[PDB]
Amino acid sequence: MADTFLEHMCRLDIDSPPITARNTGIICTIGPASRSVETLKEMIKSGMNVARLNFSHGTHEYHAETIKNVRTATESFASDPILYRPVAVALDTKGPEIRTGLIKGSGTAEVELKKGATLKITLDNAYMEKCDENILWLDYKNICKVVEVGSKIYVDDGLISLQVKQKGADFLVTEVENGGSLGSKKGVNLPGAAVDLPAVSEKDIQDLKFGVEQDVDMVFASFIRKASDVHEVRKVLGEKGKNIKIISKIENHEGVRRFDEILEASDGIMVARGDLGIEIPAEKVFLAQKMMIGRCNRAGKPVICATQMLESMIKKPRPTRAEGSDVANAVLDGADCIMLSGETAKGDYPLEAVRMQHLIAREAEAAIYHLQLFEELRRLAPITSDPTEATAVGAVEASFKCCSGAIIVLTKSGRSAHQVARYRPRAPIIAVTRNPQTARQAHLYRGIFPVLCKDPVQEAWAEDVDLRVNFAMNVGKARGFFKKGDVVIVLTGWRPGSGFTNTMRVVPVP
Amino acid sequence: MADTFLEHMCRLDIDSPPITARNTGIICTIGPASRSVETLKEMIKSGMNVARLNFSHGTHEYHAETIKNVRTATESFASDPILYRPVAVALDTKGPEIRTGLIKGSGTAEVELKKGATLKITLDNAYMEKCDENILWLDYKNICKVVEVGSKIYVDDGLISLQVKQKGADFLVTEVENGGSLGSKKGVNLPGAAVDLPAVSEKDIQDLKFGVEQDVDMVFASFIRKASDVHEVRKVLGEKGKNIKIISKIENHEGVRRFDEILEASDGIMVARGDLGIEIPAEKVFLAQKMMIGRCNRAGKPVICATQMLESMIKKPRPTRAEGSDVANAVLDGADCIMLSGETAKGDYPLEAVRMQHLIAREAEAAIYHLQLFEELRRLAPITSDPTEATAVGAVEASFKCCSGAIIVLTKSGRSAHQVARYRPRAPIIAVTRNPQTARQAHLYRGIFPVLCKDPVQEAWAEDVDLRVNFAMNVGKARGFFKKGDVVIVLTGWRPGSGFTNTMRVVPVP
Amino acid sequence: MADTFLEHMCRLDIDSPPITARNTGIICTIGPASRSVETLKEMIKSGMNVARLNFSHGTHEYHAETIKNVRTATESFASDPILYRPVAVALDTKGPEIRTGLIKGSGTAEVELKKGATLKITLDNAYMEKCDENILWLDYKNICKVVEVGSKIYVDDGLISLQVKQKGADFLVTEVENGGSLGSKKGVNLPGAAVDLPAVSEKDIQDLKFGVEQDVDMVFASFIRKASDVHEVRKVLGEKGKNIKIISKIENHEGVRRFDEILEASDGIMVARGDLGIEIPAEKVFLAQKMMIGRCNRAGKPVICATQMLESMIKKPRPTRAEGSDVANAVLDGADCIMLSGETAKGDYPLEAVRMQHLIAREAEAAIYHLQLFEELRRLAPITSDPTEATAVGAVEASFKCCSGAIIVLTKSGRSAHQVARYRPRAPIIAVTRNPQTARQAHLYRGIFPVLCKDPVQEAWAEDVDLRVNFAMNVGKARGFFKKGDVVIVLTGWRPGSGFTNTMRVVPVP
Amino acid sequence: MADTFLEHMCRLDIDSPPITARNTGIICTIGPASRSVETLKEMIKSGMNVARLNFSHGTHEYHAETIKNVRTATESFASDPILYRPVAVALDTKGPEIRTGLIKGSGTAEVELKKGATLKITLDNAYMEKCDENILWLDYKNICKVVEVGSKIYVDDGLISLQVKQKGADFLVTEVENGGSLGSKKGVNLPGAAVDLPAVSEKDIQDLKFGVEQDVDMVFASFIRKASDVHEVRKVLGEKGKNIKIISKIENHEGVRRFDEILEASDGIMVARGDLGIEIPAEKVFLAQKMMIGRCNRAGKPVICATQMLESMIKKPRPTRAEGSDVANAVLDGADCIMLSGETAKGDYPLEAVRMQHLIAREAEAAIYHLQLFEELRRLAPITSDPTEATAVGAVEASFKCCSGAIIVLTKSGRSAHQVARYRPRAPIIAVTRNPQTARQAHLYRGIFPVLCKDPVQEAWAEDVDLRVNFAMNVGKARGFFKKGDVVIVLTGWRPGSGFTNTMRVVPVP
The missing domain is CATH 2.40.33.10 (PK beta-barrel domain-like)
Structure with a gap:
């Protein structure tokens, strides 16, 4: 509501509650401390969206048992189809x-x-x-x-x-x-x-092959240096893992200098802040991080940022006082998900760490001047003739004006929700899909809340569309994003298939 | 495309052609010089949208014969239903x-x-x-x-x-x-x-009664001084002329000072520039005109401005050199229609005067910085929960982004096209109606092109809607606003009736 | 005080008085109707700043007697050195x-x-x-x-x-x-x-020679088509008329198309609106003026615009009703002086016409959104290292903040006042000079009020500077621009000579 | 140079060197680890501007020996009067x-x-x-x-x-x-x-009395809760410590809620981040910090922010890896000085910690979008008639336009440099004074570099002023802020005394 950034900061109040919705994704590493179907079930409730497997340690037999355990805890909640939450599996290569x-x-x-x-x-x-x-x-x-x-x-x-x-x-x-x-x-x-x-070691050709067979959602690619390296990984995944998202890790001077050619070849970036701080001097890593999040926001591509818990240097008191300035920084810089490595793999209190990531992430969305960001993204957008792009810009502007509580989008590949989310609207974006892999990858993009629909395809298509919209309105009220007699924007296509989104309706909540 | 108003002026080129579409309405007075079904037919082709009848002169028998002649020339072209153009009839009271x-x-x-x-x-x-x-x-x-x-x-x-x-x-x-x-x-x-x-004289109670019986489109109300005067006229039109648009003439210091209360009570304003220049000093009339057009743009209400042809004061050469700076001024100030009085009523060359109004009006739309205006109107718009308002803002923003060539709107009362036009989009607004009175009044609002549909109401409603959209696309191509394989925005409702507009589709032209 | 242009227009009031200062210059043609030392004295009081001599008609003997008469009326008021007003003489060539x-x-x-x-x-x-x-x-x-x-x-x-x-x-x-x-x-x-x-005819080589001998302030050059034509005129004036300002008349398609190369070679432009309207179609002349005033504002160069009085086309009433929409237009477009030809040369009521130009010019400064203009000019200004440019930007910004009533500038060539005036500050710019030719040419630039100082050069330089500042403060209070205990900005140099302006002081009025 | 904040972030380069000038002040606590005239001399070279004494521990005899040792190391460098650097002494009360x-x-x-x-x-x-x-x-x-x-x-x-x-x-x-x-x-x-x-304890009435006698530069006031508490401290300092700056520590919910009344009564704020995090929940302290720095920037009042060194929570490697994200955050939020407590008082490596504060502070000035800040501060500034305010706005705008390398300001109380610094110009502000207490307090305001002048007052005043300007130009070249034949802005008054600043000159460096 402020005209300036300085007014915006001056009006921050500490006696006001936050919204229930948390825009930023939460990625947890799984090791021995949290391999168990009871620990897993408990982190899913705490707000874990992605489970990362590190292929430095362990064998292929050991990892296959972690994947099995991740899926068992996930599917435990697939009894109340309204409160089910999908959970991705990712794979970090050891790297050359x-x-x-x-x-x-x-x-x-x-x-x-x-x-x-x-x-x-x-x-x-x-x-x-x-x-x-x-x-x-x-x-x-x-x-x-x-x-x-x-x-x-x-x-x-x-x-x-x-x-x-x-x-x-x-x-x-x-x-x-x-x-x-x-x-x-x-x-x-x-x-x-x-x-x-080489781009891929002899070991990682074997791990990339294991992941395609194990049906993983995304691959984290280590030690990317040029746009040819990304192309190499894409050949090894073949035409059987052609949907698997490649995220390029940036971790040396060269990959930083050649950033713009990598971004174009990739599906998203990860700013490996530990690794980058060995090769680059400490006070320069700070700037290189902001430059890369900036460029990823402007291109409409997701950017993960790998963080840590910090403690005070001079320690006389007994409490650890887990200092999460590192985490809050990245949320403000405009990261899409945040990652916690050691604290969840081998550490003693895994649940406590997921609960911390959540509470910080939620609160720090208050301090962003969301209006300046939003205008800014709309100016650096090109005139096209693509119907879908025009539907999305329409939806986002309608939504300011009526103060809608949600934007419902039907999607198969995820692409129509991705176009809406690149503007960063105030309202949550609910994506309704039947494709179970699409609901998993949706956690990478900031502000999308996926809902998977299990029902059988109805006879008349028009009637199918009206079923998935309604499903989406129940799930919205249950999770408390809007109540009855509110206004929502709904976004759909004219025929079945991918690539035909063209309609925008403004409807009262039933 | 310019960032500034000074850049915008510096890039004006005199070796570039204008568009075919003329946004501003043209109102002509009908007297003895142009009462005839042959002169009338010829002015309709030249670009006349409204025919004004002045109830100072003549009797009720004489005027009824002008109305009959206006309707005969109009209906002459109702044989090719694509090239038909509707024409309003207005009524200027003598006034107290x-x-x-x-x-x-x-x-x-x-x-x-x-x-x-x-x-x-x-x-x-x-x-x-x-x-x-x-x-x-x-x-x-x-x-x-x-x-x-x-x-x-x-x-x-x-x-x-x-x-x-x-x-x-x-x-x-x-x-x-x-x-x-x-x-x-x-x-x-x-x-x-x-x-x-009094608000209405004993003579004008009789003329306002004659107009309701003769089925006129709008009434020009003389010598309005307060918001109670407007209310008086509305009582005399009764509940049988409740659709007739009241335009308040402003023509003394008091009506200027009390402007804001009149605007609210009226359907539109007329800035009677001759009349106002007797009571107010000459160099102040200039400012009072800009203030009133400004306020009418901000309220989303149409403002007619009554002009004249000028000639040079020192005249040695034989040609008249009809100087139309007066006309061009008003188009730039942001008037919705312009009026020509004497030149068309009693003058010797009526056709020549309509052809001049047209050619000036068209050309002077080049010099407006339309971008600054458009942004400006969107900022001074309130957040509401009205579905229709949100559909309209969506349509207008979609239309920039895809560079659409038209916005098609289905309407009964005209109200849904009025909401779109208050933003002043670049693209022409085609309104498709069955109501013949609605197609006539549409000439008051800047940038709306009405098309009347004569076909019989189909059985299935969905199928009726698809017929009126197609009609609108033929009429659009015939008049040359877009060709095949262009993009248009189409705007409609979910059920039959007034007040239910909620859907926006982006479609390729068939 | 408004944030927008639409707010600005909506707040115009017709019950509020204007300031005494009139920013825009007034150029009058002198013929038989107003060649006399009694008529001249009376127009100087009415607000005439420049007297134009048209070298189409008359001989060299006849014109030399008009110049003599212009100077006699001017010097009549050189008895009260506070209320003296300088008056330029210009020379319009017949042209090829x-x-x-x-x-x-x-x-x-x-x-x-x-x-x-x-x-x-x-x-x-x-x-x-x-x-x-x-x-x-x-x-x-x-x-x-x-x-x-x-x-x-x-x-x-x-x-x-x-x-x-x-x-x-x-x-x-x-x-x-x-x-x-x-x-x-x-x-x-x-x-x-x-x-x-050719650029100059055989006749005009003789007239340009007569003007250098008669000591004229500026030359109006007819039928300029290219930047080489301007260079030709400059050679004929020689090195004895090297101070004489050349104003290029634009009056055909070619000079319009090649505008940017002429502007650079010239000292200012004149938009000869009668002449341009024979060669170019009537509705295009409108845009071509506007493009040229725009470019002259952006380059910091003065632009004269030659106007006329208009009357209504259908004339039943007896009064002439001198319609000055033509004049008001140009003031708003951002012209620096306006010209009246016939009305003052051969017409019957010369005084009445000067009094009209004045009253219009004054009033129409109300409707400009001066804030948007001012910001706009400051953005399209280049970073330099020239001390003088930086002094000027300082002076103009100081002046907003303290709401000063005047900017006093000491100048020899006029150049330091020209740099201040290119920003269009709200406050009047008083230029204090000893050079009598510099005080005359100052009427070309919008918002500069020249004052000529006649006193003998004091011994100590610092003491000379303090005398000319004080003179300027008396003349300011007499003409009523500020009273005692107001604030003024004063602008001067560190040594005697041209090109050394570097100091800015904020002083209370004594 | 960027038009947007998103462009600005995208253009950050890690292969470009920073400027020599460090805008932000550095406050160090002195305990047993760094009480010695050899350790002190070495921290002064590293970039320490203020020495804080904590009156929780020690007696009055013990502290008086630290003050003596701080002054001895300071005065060691008062032999080369060009390279001398002044150093303040502050006093933290124990508090109720x-x-x-x-x-x-x-x-x-x-x-x-x-x-x-x-x-x-x-x-x-x-x-x-x-x-x-x-x-x-x-x-x-x-x-x-x-x-x-x-x-x-x-x-x-x-x-x-x-x-x-x-x-x-x-x-x-x-x-x-x-x-x-x-x-x-x-x-x-x-x-x-x-x-x-109570506002002051019985112990602190004795410490506030000891500090006035020991001639300290500023007092840090603990546990401020209301604007009456600040008034109490001011009475105890008396009329003999009336120049001593009072900085209010904010450290509970109440002082946060009643912030605006304290700010007005104080000379500056300190955001005691350790203390505030006991009373307020951890994730709210984050917001309360940004709100208070925001309000202090808008009021033109200095805000100290008390920080710490952090380390990684899971520690397998041997190096400490002193993580300075905490420090960099505050510099970006727009803090004026940063403080380090334990690391310099009792810690093992004091020099290393000052060298870290310096290197971080310098580098993190790169990432601020200084243009948006600067415009923003100029808009929320009121029109006044104060000559000094207008001189300052003039100086700052001149300085953009010529890209000056410094703004020289002569000052007695410091007040004229304070007005310039509230705009946050790009160029360093050199303050030239004879008052030794004024040179010390100047370290509180961001971007002012004080220089103290020791020379005897010359006979003619004009000649005194020209000596202090030249001194300032030598000191500027020695410290490498500009070289010969650069441009500087110089700012001074018309008579001797405080409150008469009114002149701005743009000069070449001799």
Whole structure:
């Protein structure tokens, strides 16, 4: 209601309650702490929309049992078809890696190195058994060609740094920049450097194949560097996983610099904030995050942002005081879902963490100046002749003017709800579908609430359409989005099929 | 396409053609020069939308023959039901008046008066036969109570002015401010003064009754001063002329000062620019005109503006050079129709004058910054729960985005087309009706093109609706507003009746 | 004070008085009706700022006596140095022309031609004595090369039109499009055609030389077609008339099409609306003015607009009712001065016409939405490092905030006042100069009020500056722009010379 | 340079360097870790502007030795008068408190209480020696009157919560809501409750007196609840500390609800984020912070925000990874200085923490859309007649247009620099003063860089002014804000004294 952003901030009140609807999606990692059909059932009630499986750890037998358990808890509530809530399954690839050899043969032995000490790095397979505080063997056979003189090298999550001093054929002579402890099989990161590793490793061709067979909703693709890498993943999923959404993880200088070509090839972005903060300096990661959420909002594409719980540095008191400034930040920046990794996989209090994500996410929607955003998105939209685009703009403007409580949209592929949601209307968008995969992927887009319809297809089509609209109005009242004698916008097509949405009706709630 | 008003003006090109559609209505007065079924037929082709009858002159027998002739020429073209054009009939009341008595008994005698000479004005009926250059008799019996000391009096269209010097009971002693010639039965105007004459004269109760019997489309009400005067006219039309549109003429200081209460009571305003320029000083009439067109645009109510042809003051060349700056001004100010009085009633070249109004009106729509106007009207619109208002805002926004070539609206009373037109969309608004009175009144609102449908009501209602939409698409292509494989917005209701408009479809032209 | 343009129009009141200051300049033509030192003295009091001399008529002896008389009336008021008002002298060239030969030898004989009749046009000098209703001789020797087949020709101010039928070497065979009367020595106009006549005629090289010798303030240059024509005039004025302002008259399709290159070469534009309306169709002249005033406002260059008095076409009443819609239009479009030709040269009531221009000009400044204009001009201004530009922007913004009643500027060439005036501040701009030519040219720019200072240059410079500021504050209070204990902005430089303005002080009026 | 906020975010680049100037102030707490003249000297170089002394701990003898040491390190650099940097001293009151009695007589004994157990709270002084797990003695004698039935009570930083069950005269019977350990002399907090404690305690009347004697720059006032409390502090400082800035700490529901009356009475606000998060729920503190920074920007008053360093909750790696999202947030919200408490008082690496605050603060100024802020502040500014206000608006607008590198302002009280800084110009504001207290307080306002001038007052005043301007231009070039042949705005008055600023000059850098 404010004319300015400064007025808007000045009128924030702490003695007023929020709405029931929570626009932002919640993604939880599943490990040993929460693999069980009783823990799962309880997180679904707390507000979990997506379950992420991390294919770094475990085998294919172990994961298949987590998927089975995720589906069992989901289907428990498929008895009251009004209060059923769909839940997606995603798959994080391990992704292409560079690793050191075994230290002193054993693998449990640790050799400590001091600042200044020059060491040689060798690519020859003789030294892969015995690495000492003078010779390190790396798995990467092309490191010499990608590295330059003056380039830095990080060993094990940026604990040890090496300055490149002398560049030679099949060997590198390096000064030591930081002191730490070298263990066996530790990961290597090469800042600045435009790495030449393949798009998919030999291991991930097997995991991408396992996911298509296990019928997953989306794939998180690690270490994306160019638009050709995204194209590679799409070939491996084949024509049998052609519906599976590819989300590109951005996690080095190069993928940041070449962002615009990746965005175009992908189905959505993830800003892997831990990973990005090893390669990029800490105070620059802050800016790179806002730039990527900004560009994803302007293109109408979903952007996941991977967060953490923080605590105070000086700790005298006993309580943990789980500080969720990190989470609230992203909601405000205009992220579509937020992710919690460790806190839900191996941590001690999983339910408590989902309940925190929820309560923060809900409250922080108050502080956005939604009006400025909404106008702004409508200006950078092109004139077209596509009937569907024009229906959507009509629906969104009607909805301001009558202060409607919901926009109902019938959809098969999800595409018609996606066009409405790119404007960020105030009103919740209910999508009514029969396709069960479409109801799952809908959690990626901010402000869409999917409802799946189970009923048998009626004889007359006009009569089928009127059944799915009514279903949607019951589910709306049950979940408390509007009551009787309110106004809703309803959006549909003229014939059966995908791509024919063209009608907008303004109706009273029965 | 310009961001500013200054850019907009700088990009005007004189080597580019205009569109075929002319948004502004054209009202012509009918007198002896153009009472004939051959002259009438020819003005209808030139672009005449309304025929005005002036009830100052003629009798009731004479006017009834003009109406008959207007209808005959109209119905001549009702053979090709696609190219038929409806034509309204309006009625200008004579309106309440003050007149002087006979000069020197004869009525043809003229007595000239010089500056300074004090004369008496008497209300007593003895002097009504013989008025001299010392005693004038006026018809108004309450002039003494409404006039003050220092008030001016205008005799015969502001030729002679009288300053009030001495105020007495039943007599006025007046200095002479301007010299001229006094004739017999000349009209009196009293600037500043809040006159007490009745709302309708004894003559106009008879004319308002004649018009209801003759089935006229709208009534022009003279000398409106307050919102009670408008209410009086509405009682005389009764409940048998309850559809007849009342347009209030504004023609004195008081009606200007009390504008906002009249606007609310009326169906539209007319800015009688000749009349207003006798009572108000010449350089103030300019401002009073813009203020009233402004307020009528903001309220969503039509405003007629009565204009003239001008010529150059110093005339050496033989051509008349009909200067239409007066006409172009009003189109730009945001008038809905323009009127031409004398040029069409008694003048020598009637067709030429209608062809001029048309050509000016068309061209001057180029110079309006339509974008600034359109945004501006949408901001000063209130949030409601009325389904119809929300349908209309939806239709208008859809129409920008797809660059549609027309908005088709089905209507009975005209009300649904009126709501769309209050936004001033770029696209022409086609109204499809069966009601023949509704198609006539549609000429008052800027940018609506009425089409009347003659076909018999089909059995199934859904099938009736689809017939009137198609009719509208043929008439659209014939008149050349869009071709095949263009996009149109269509706007309709869910059941038969008035007040149920709620649906908006975006369709390809068949 | 309004947020919108529609609110602004709705709040116009007819019961409120205007300010004393009149921003727009008034240019009067001087002929026989007003050549006299008594008529002149009286127009100077009425509000005449510039006296135009038309070098079509009269000789060099006759004009030199008008100039002498203009200066005598001016200097009459140079006794009270506070109430003195400076007055410019301008010079309208006759400009390059094409004329027909003598009809039937006599020159007073007239031959009438009917529609259809083919006539030959010959360039050979044998027929220049005897022109008949079959053979016309034209002065232009290159007409054959500039004209095309299908091109039209206008003879004597567009009375007769000729369609080109057959094109031959040294002869033209032409159909007759309009019928009229051919006289002797009538002017020829060639629409569309990119004419090849020289920039200055042999006569105007003599008049431009006479004006430099007579010390005129500005030259009006007729029939400008390209940026090379303007350069030609500048060479003829030499280096002795290098201060004289060149105003380019625009009066054909070509000068309109090539506008942007002329504007850059000129000191200001004149939109000769009579002349432009012979060559261009009547309803297009409307747009072409408007485009040119718009571009002149954006470039910060003055634009004169030449107007007329109009009267009603159907005239039954005795009063002339001098209709000044033409004049009010231009003030609103954003013209800097307005001109009146015939009404002041040969007409019967010269004083009455100057008093009309004044009263209209003053009143019509009420209806401009000055806020939208002002913001708009500030956005399309480039970042520079010029101290003077930054001083000016500072002065104008300070002046809003304190609601100052005047901006005082010391100037030698006029350039520092010109930079302030390009923003169109609300407050009057007083320019204080010693240069008498600078005080004269200041009437071209909208909103500058020049004051000339006659006092002897004081010894200490700082003390000189403080004398000219005070002079300016007396003249301001006398003319009633502000009273004692008001606030003014004062603008000056750090050293003597041109080009050093850099200081802005906010002072209380003493 | 962007038209929108969404464009602005999309154009953020991570391969571009920041400016040298850091707009936001840095406040450090001084304890045992950094009381030494060698540690102090080193933090001054790192970017410390204010040294805070916490009057909870220590005696008056101990603090007087910290002040002495702060001044010694400051004055070390007063040898090169160009590179000297002034440093303020502030004083945080302990503030009014409620405390429990001794547990079981000893004071080191702890009694643990379980959920459910009803305990009595007694105000009678018999039980103040022996408190058990049934009877607690509180210092507050009016708790019964301020508390209601259903009100909660927090004991020792919200470890234990008590629900009020039964309300009686001089006793409270309370359910236990949370279990913990009760110690001796633990602080009590009463949410919702409009507490009646005095404005200043008996201890703080002594500390406020010590600070006036020790010549401190500003006083931080704890537990402000109403505009009368601020008035009380102002009386105790007397008329000998009338220049000392009062900053009101906001730290309960009441002070938040009554914010607008406090702001008006104060010299600036501090948002004590730790303290506020005990009384208010965690997810509401987030909003209350943005509301208060918003209101302080709109009123032109400085707002300090007290922050912390955070670390990741799940910690497997060895590095601390000092997460400064908390700090970056506040800079973006539009805080004027940021504070670090523990990290600098008792922590192990003080220098490292100041270097972190600096590096974050600098970088996060990149992401603000400074243009939208700047326009926004100029719209909500009132028209006045104050010369100084108009000079300031002039200076700020000039400065955009010429892209100046600095605004130099001469000031005695600081007031003229404060008016410029309330607009938030892009260019740094250098304030040149002789008053040493004025140079210290200047660190509170965002974007002002004070320079103190030590030279002797010259004879001619005009010549004094020209010396202080030049000093300011040397100091500007040394610190690298502009080089030779750049442009600066300079702002000064017409006579000596406070309150006469009226002149603005645009000068080239010598």
